[PDB]
Amino acid sequence: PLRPATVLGTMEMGRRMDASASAASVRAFLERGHSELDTAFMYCDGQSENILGGLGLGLGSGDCTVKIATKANPWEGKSLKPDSIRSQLETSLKRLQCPRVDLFYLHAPDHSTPVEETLCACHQLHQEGKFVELGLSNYASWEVAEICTLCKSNGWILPTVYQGMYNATTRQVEAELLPCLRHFGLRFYAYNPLAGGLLTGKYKYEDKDGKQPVGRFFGNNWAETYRNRFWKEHHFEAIALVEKALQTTYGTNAPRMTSAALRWMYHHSQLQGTRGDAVILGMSSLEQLEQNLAATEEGPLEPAVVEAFDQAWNMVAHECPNYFR
Ligand SMILES: NC(=O)c1ccc[n+]([C@@H]2O[C@H](COP(=O)([O-])OP(=O)(O)OC[C@H]3O[C@@H](n4cnc5c(N)ncnc54)[C@H](OP(=O)(O)O)[C@@H]3O)[C@@H](O)[C@H]2O)c1
Numbered sequence: 001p002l003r004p005a006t007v008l009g010t011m012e013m014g015r016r017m018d019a020s021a022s023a024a025s026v027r028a029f030l031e032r033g034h035s036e037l038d039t040a041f042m043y044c045d046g047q048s049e050n051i052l053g054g055l056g057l058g059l060g061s062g063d064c065t066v067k068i069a070t071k072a073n074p075w076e077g078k079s080l081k082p083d084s085i086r087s088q089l090e091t092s093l094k095r096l097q098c099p100r101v102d103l104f105y106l107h108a109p110d111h112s113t114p115v116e117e118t119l120c121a122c123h124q125l126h127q128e129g130k131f132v133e134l135g136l137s138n139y140a141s142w143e144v145a146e147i148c149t150l151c152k153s154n155g156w157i158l159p160t161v162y163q164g165m166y167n168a169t170t171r172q173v174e175a176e177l178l179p180c181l182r183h184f185g186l187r188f189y190a191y192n193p194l195a196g197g198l199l200t201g202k203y204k205y206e207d208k209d210g211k212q213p214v215g216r217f218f219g220n221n222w223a224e225t226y227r228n229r230f231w232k233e234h235h236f237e238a239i240a241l242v243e244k245a246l247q248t249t250y251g252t253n254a255p256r257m258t259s260a261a262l263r264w265m266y267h268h269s270q271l272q273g274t275r276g277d278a279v280i281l282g283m284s285s286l287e288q289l290e291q292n293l294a295a296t297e298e299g300p301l302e303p304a305v306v307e308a309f310d311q312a313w314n315m316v317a318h319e320c321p322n323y324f325r
Contacts, residue, residue: 004271005278006296007036007069007189008289014047015220016284022051024286030066032293038163038189038280039096040071040107041088049095060098068096069103069161071137074110081113082121089130103161104131108138108325115143116150123156135161137191140324141180148184159186163280165323166190166271167199168264168309169238170230172320178270187276193265194258194282195230201243201257205236215284229321238312245308259295264309267300 008029013022039048059068072088074080136159151158164173196216212218246254271277283289
């Protein structure tokens with residue numbers, strides 16, 4: 001088929017990446033012919049949205065090539081109650097300097113708020129023109145099915161996108177979530193395509209006790225969460241397996257682990273570009289992004305390497321982190 005689409009992740013805009021690095025990145029991304037951006041109310045205390053709103057992209061003014069997604073979250077007391085959802089979205093619109101977003105997600109479940117309450121509110125906001133499509137992230141397949149079923153019966157807008165954790169060594173979503181989304185007509189966007197950077201091969205397990213190199217896995221408030229998600233001895237072993245396969249198969253022409261990992265996504269995963277499925281790229285620099293953008297344009301990997309990626313998943317599958325929260 002056509003390959004999956006490519007979406008630009010903006011989680012680092014306002015933390016490691018300033019307005020100028022951010023602009024450069026978006027420019028680089030658009031030059032490759034891509035068009036969707038992914039942000040959230042949460043990112044950098046609103047700076048990711050603020051940065052994007054100032055880039056003069058005319059977001060949400062249909063007459064408009066660039067598509068924006070944002071998300072409302074229940075954290076730090078906010079809940080996904082109707083007033084909370086509305087406030088988050090209205091704040092996001094202000095920061096993005098736009099009258100409506102193309103895609104609005106529920107960022108993660110609020111297990112203390114009945115989902116019908118949240119959905120009804122989403123439907124109202126859509127009726128007001130504040131977003132085009134609804135999405136879900138970090139809900140379990142069964143929770144997705146409940147939501148779609150409830151929307152159908154109540155005349156609410158159905159979610160059409162699911163944003164989920166997926167990479168060569170993180171495949172829990174395959175068994176149940178994907179079949180569920182296919183049944184109910186949702187496309188799937190993959191986050192953590194490089195396992196937060198673990199799939200670059202840049203780390204060694206014992207970095208956790210020693211170097212503690214500043215980044216995704218050290219120094220910030222989600223770091224421990226990231227380490228619990230991915231920083232496992234079998235995951236390192238699994239990566240080494242793949243690196244060895246890349247050397248044996250390609251020799252001096254071997255692609256970098258980063259570029260192998262991304263190529264897995266675009267060529268060897270269960271993402272289907274004909275369904276509108278996509279990979280959300282991540283970066284904390286322009287230079288990382290350019291590398292990643294180049295990888296997305298490379299071709300399939302050799303069979304021996306694809307096999308090694310399967311072996312690598314088989315090693316970590318028993319301790320795979322939950323795509324759902
Ligand atoms: N829905 C959700 O709950 C959710 C969750 C996560 C992400 N997302 C979205 O998806 C986007 C991407 O996910 P992600 O950031 O987790 O993707 P990722 O590609 O798995 O992680 C990206 C991180 O890996 C490192 N990296 C990327 N390219 C590199 C390269 N070429 N060389 C060396 N290191 C490299 C950088 O980390 P360091 O430089 O910091 O080491 C970068 O911040 C986000 O920006 C956000 O929009 C959504």
